[PDB]
Design a protein around this ligand. Structure first.
Ligand SMILES: NC(=O)c1ccc[n+]([C@@H]2O[C@H](COP(=O)([O-])OP(=O)(O)OC[C@H]3O[C@@H](n4cnc5c(N)ncnc54)[C@H](O)[C@@H]3O)[C@@H](O)[C@H]2O)c1
Ligand SMILES: NC(=O)c1ccc[n+]([C@@H]2O[C@H](COP(=O)([O-])OP(=O)(O)OC[C@H]3O[C@@H](n4cnc5c(N)ncnc54)[C@H](O)[C@@H]3O)[C@@H](O)[C@H]2O)c1
Ligand SMILES: NC(=O)c1ccc[n+]([C@@H]2O[C@H](COP(=O)([O-])OP(=O)(O)OC[C@H]3O[C@@H](n4cnc5c(N)ncnc54)[C@H](O)[C@@H]3O)[C@@H](O)[C@H]2O)c1
Ligand SMILES: NC(=O)c1ccc[n+]([C@@H]2O[C@H](COP(=O)([O-])OP(=O)(O)OC[C@H]3O[C@@H](n4cnc5c(N)ncnc54)[C@H](O)[C@@H]3O)[C@@H](O)[C@H]2O)c1
Ligand SMILES: O=C1O[C@@](c2ccccc2)(c2ccccc2O)CC(O)=C1Sc1ccccc1Cl
Ligand SMILES: O=C1O[C@@](c2ccccc2)(c2ccccc2O)CC(O)=C1Sc1ccccc1Cl
Ligand SMILES: O=C1O[C@@](c2ccccc2)(c2ccccc2O)CC(O)=C1Sc1ccccc1Cl
Lengths: 325, 327, 323, 324
């Protein structure tokens, strides 16, 4: 009799499949920020990390494990082999590297990652964070063979969060109570939907018809410009962004894992909307839950706003048709 | 009229002061992990960040602000000037480049000579939580420089050591670390002392069940659990370069007890003069009751002759270094 | 020496004045639901309970205290005497019985000066019905500036509305936005123009929204907000859980200085052609100083007229009250 | 096309089943305290309520539903028919009256338990209804479940009360005051003095008279207060609810999140302490997604073993006469 056998009488050895498992692929700054935020929100009963850099992977794993006393996630695993990811409800991909090469190089990474993920978690939802996110969501969708509902791109979720932060600073109101949607292509070409911006259901555009135009005395257009300038500025200042993307991703994870059916601006296949007929992924408000994107909101856009999304779809398809699978 | 004034009618513009403000000094890997953990536990109404590297400081500030939608800490500020830290309840020092030990002391004392008086100037009534290494020496140093009473100068101490210990114990037993109790005390790091007599699950003493526990005669080598606390630490540095997540979680747990006045007991570093035959002004980890006045009480653990000798030895070495420090 | 002194060496005995204290007055179904909700949200470092029924009060305190292991609120106290409430940041009034209003006024004549004596700088949050009138009564008796006297108002009404909207749309209520303003309860006003998902206006899509001639009868969503409350009283005898949760949401914003916007009852003279000292719900920014700002909702003529009629009705009652 | 269709484009209508459903049976003071505590802890994606009083059930359901904006449990259902409870991970039984006390809750359980097993054959059963140790045996007998999936709330609350009182005496948070009350829930529970400690410092070693009549500080009265304060609370407010609700939600947390934390709950103790009868008593158990996977073999003094054994004989004496 060992000490363990002297202290503890076992009733059954029958270990079960983990029921609420999340995997993060890529343990760089983004991936780890996603990991810590997911752990502090108690979303998973098992977390798996994967990367190609083996020492860094083990170290990050152990560092999380050593905080186990302060968490409610009883099993943290990692490995280069995707067997550690088996039976994940949700797999978050943050792995990634002129700049048309860059796309094909991340496609090449995805050619390896995606089939391994699918092999071990055929029923998972895929959440793509890697950039350029809209293209890479299409790539994951294409390589995986999943229905469109199970391939979600982070998209404009962070863009909108920044927008609401900035709006909140201008109005002196918590971002939670400042509503506004940045849609379309993540990053420099995103579209701020001025018609939807509100506090307490009071449309800013109705109060201030010049809102978001060049005639706007207060230049609210700057808020959206600042959304892009902020991201360049953070990179210039600290070298990367981590905390904000980690938090926005944990929020998406919460909706999926808990089947909340909250509405988030994420990247989904928008074929058949806004005059678009190519297989491209762009952000619109989506209902997120246990089967992923079940529904999307049909935002009423101005002709200018539809045109901007159309141009994005055309540019995105232009790149995609040239990619090698 | 501006859009804001059309939308919003102001009842008053009295600018008041934060009620539950926390400052983190040094926004490296440790400091920023501390920050995210504190933010995700809703412990503060204002978070202030200080560092000497101005671009890194701003970028970190901005990156947290951008996650505001997902948090309930409405104000995050930063700056090189300590005026951003005014009226903090709790100030956490994680400053100084990560790591000989005497040369580490030397450079972190010099940093503290600048940091601590600026913290005291703006937050005279704060609790100071020292994380920077060597943590026991630097807790003494903060207490000497600040002039604060003993209760308000807390060193992270063996809080992480004990958490690592409990993780490892839980792994061998198949029990959650929360339900595996055991205390690593004394000097943080290489010379810490595992108190075998206190190790238990459900009040069942492991040492009583297994008298060889922690001795060289133990066939299950439970002494390796404490050795693995030490080895774990070196291994994480080898693998990723630094520790961040575990220390950040451990610090947020201490902040929780202090901000919410919980009077929970934690292994942290406090002025141990008067215990264990120790007559010098040294800080070492014992179990301390933490609350809104910091360390209000400490637990008097019965130690074996050997365990007591190790604390005494640490106290002798630490006082040997400290007596030569120039203030 | 005692076991305590053998185990524990004390560094200092000194006790601070409470830093994040909440008081709930009235330990009925509403008061206790507010209490449990506040406790499970870790909003207070000290909770005080006050009621006139001493056995009930003691029993409720002990039951909560016996749950201390599972909570992070280390001091829970109670008493008939308001000395237990000293230095509260937030005092929540849920105690209660033209007859009924005056009976609650009489209760408030005892309660409010006692609250003020022991927490002169607190925010008051009034839950007791009829809430809009009794928030006015607390304001008058206390002598507090209007920013520190807040009525639970239409926070619950709006939460119900968002629950019903969410059910109809297949969307979580958090993403279903819509505001019920004005007088709490029967005479509340659903603001159809603000009802939206993701910034998409339902009224703009569906102009019949909120009219009697609406084929989908979306007006019934607001009627069911009123019908819901009567049904719950019919079926179980009182409402508690929803109101408790709604009050804790308000407390969170105040105690954490969030500056979120909530539909709560505030002194509305100077808006919407209202010229009397009446409290009605509009969207208000809530924080450490209570209500610092309000949102000026653009109302239709019919919406405005409903608020004005409530104002006249409330004031018609209030002018008759003896203090 | 409705407004819903005008607003929302549906990608798929593939309907789903909950992944983390919990059922509470009985919506009285205890049941609803369990429910609100479970809801505020985000343990379930679906909560089902069952009771025989139809208006009360509907009204309590509605009341919780109305606070949905402030919760993260997207569906609350209720019903008289146990089809509303299908595929529950965890079913908490709090129904029954607050020799006669036992046989009447037994009769309730003859209806309830088969109905639960029918719709959720793989669930963990958590029994709260009193007398909890007896009704846990009854649930186990009727269900045919393996013993790991039938758990009584047992002495989780007694130990929580003990730790509260200990904490008040020492000036330490109950979380940091360790002490186990085992055996029978209620009058005959056993305080394990040898395990009582702060920071692993044994109070019995520091204070040898701890738990004896010779004790000048009368620590034995702390355990007496645990036994009593329940009667005290019933006398003052009519029932207990909040503490039990909090304790049940703590157990539910460990089950639903597979935490493998140790709690004192009622389990089959035949084979321990010389006990031979099919009796349930509280010992410390490791709780996770398979219910009680393991138990801690506390080392008891001869007096302590004698006390548990006496309880086992008493309970069996009642149980042998019950008719199923
Ligand atoms: N959508 C958004 O809003 C959002 C915001 C920030 C970052 N991103 C993206 O996240 C990605 C990563 O960001 P980062 O800062 O952590 O970069 P990083 O370089 O620090 O980390 C990337 C990690 O991916 C790993 N990796 C590379 N190939 C891999 C493979 N085949 N399998 C497993 N792991 C592999 C790398 O080793 C590295 O650890 C980038 O594409 C970045 O653009 C997008
Ligand atoms: N006690 C424990 O259990 C525990 C565990 C891990 C780390 N630590 C310690 O925490 C400290 C920090 O670790 P790290 O990895 O974050 O180091 P780091 O180098 O990543 O960061 C240090 C930060 O301190 C800043 N800094 C330097 N001088 C400063 C000054 N005068 N004022 C303000 N800020 C200043 C640096 O610019 C830098 O941003 C180290 O001493 C490390 O050993 C202790
Ligand atoms: N504003 C809202 O949305 C909301 C919703 C529900 C209830 N309410 C109101 O909450 C109030 C109470 O609801 P309830 O169901 O808990 O009623 P209750 O009758 O169950 O409990 C009321 C408590 O008030 C206490 N009380 C009476 N006089 C007192 C005094 N002078 N000092 C201290 N306490 C005193 C009683 O003793 C009792 O415990 C009612 O006015 C009710 O209408 C409003
Ligand atoms: N284990 C503990 O530590 C602990 C603490 C408190 C109470 N309890 C017990 O919990 C039980 C309930 O306490 P309470 O205060 O909630 O009682 P209660 O009277 O308020 O509620 C009991 C509910 O059970 C319902 N019920 C009765 N028969 C039913 C059936 N066949 N099917 C479904 N529901 C049925 C009743 O309608 C009622 O709603 C009692 O046995 C009490 O002793 C145990
Ligand atoms: O903030 C971000 O950081 C990155 C970026 C990309 C392109 C331009 C600026 C920043 C980045 C660059 C290099 C290394 C790490 C990074 O995370 C990646 C990225 O998508 C964002 S978010 C963003 C970016 C541009 C505009 C608006 C928004 Cl909301
Ligand atoms: O884990 C830690 O990391 C550091 C360390 C110090 C000395 C020996 C090993 C590690 C470290 C070194 C370099 C860079 C960054 C670091 O955080 C600092 C530190 O105190 C710890 S904790 C620890 C250390 C040694 C033994 C047992 C424990 Cl629990
Ligand atoms: O839901 C409520 O319950 C009470 C009520 C008051 C007046 C009419 C119906 C119900 C009630 C009655 C009796 C006993 C206890 C109670 O809480 C009190 C009350 O304000 C509400 S909220 C409400 C009430 C009416 C319409 C719409 C709404 Cl949103």
């Amino acid at each position: 009799a060992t000490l363990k056998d002297q202290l503890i009488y076992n009733l059954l050895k029958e270990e079960q499949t983990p029921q609420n498992k999340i995997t993060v692929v890529g343990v760089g700054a983004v991936g780890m920020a996603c990991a810590i935020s997911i752990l502090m929100k108690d979303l998973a009963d098992e977390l798996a990390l994967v990367d190609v850099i083996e020492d860094k992977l083990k170290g990050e794993m152990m560092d999380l494990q050593h905080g186990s006393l302060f968490l409610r996630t009883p099993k943290i695993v990692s490995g280069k082999d995707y067997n550690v990811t088996a039976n994940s409800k949700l797999v978050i991909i943050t792995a990634g590297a002129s700049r048309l090469n860059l796309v094909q190089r991340n496609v090449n990474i995805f050619k390896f990652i995606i089939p391994n993920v699918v092999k071990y978690s055929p029923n998972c939802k895929l959440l793509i964070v890697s950039n350029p996110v809209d293209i890479l969501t299409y790539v994951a969708w294409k390589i995986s063979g999943f229905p469109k509902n199970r391939v979600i791109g982070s998209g404009c979720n962070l863009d909108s969060a920044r927008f609401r932060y900035l709006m909140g600073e201008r109005l002196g109101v918590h971002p939670l109570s400042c509503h506004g949607w940045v849609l379309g292509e993540h990053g420099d070409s995103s579209v701020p939907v001025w018609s939807g911006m509100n506090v307490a259901g009071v449309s800013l555009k109705t109060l201030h018809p010049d809102l978001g135009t060049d005639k706007d005395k207060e230049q609210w257009k700057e808020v959206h410009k600042q959304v892009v300038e902020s991201a360049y500025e953070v990179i210039k200042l600290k070298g990367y962004t981590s905390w904000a993307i980690g938090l926005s991703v944990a929020d998406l994870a919460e909706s999926i894992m808990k089947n909340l059916r909250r509405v988030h601006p994420v990247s989904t296949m928008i074929k058949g909307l806004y005059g678009i007929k190519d297989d491209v992924f762009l952000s619109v408000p989506c209902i997120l839950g246990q089967n992923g994107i079940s529904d999307l909101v049909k935002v009423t856009l101005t002709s200018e706003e539809e045109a901007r999304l159309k141009k994005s779809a055309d540019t995105l398809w232009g790149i995609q048709k040239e990619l090698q699978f």
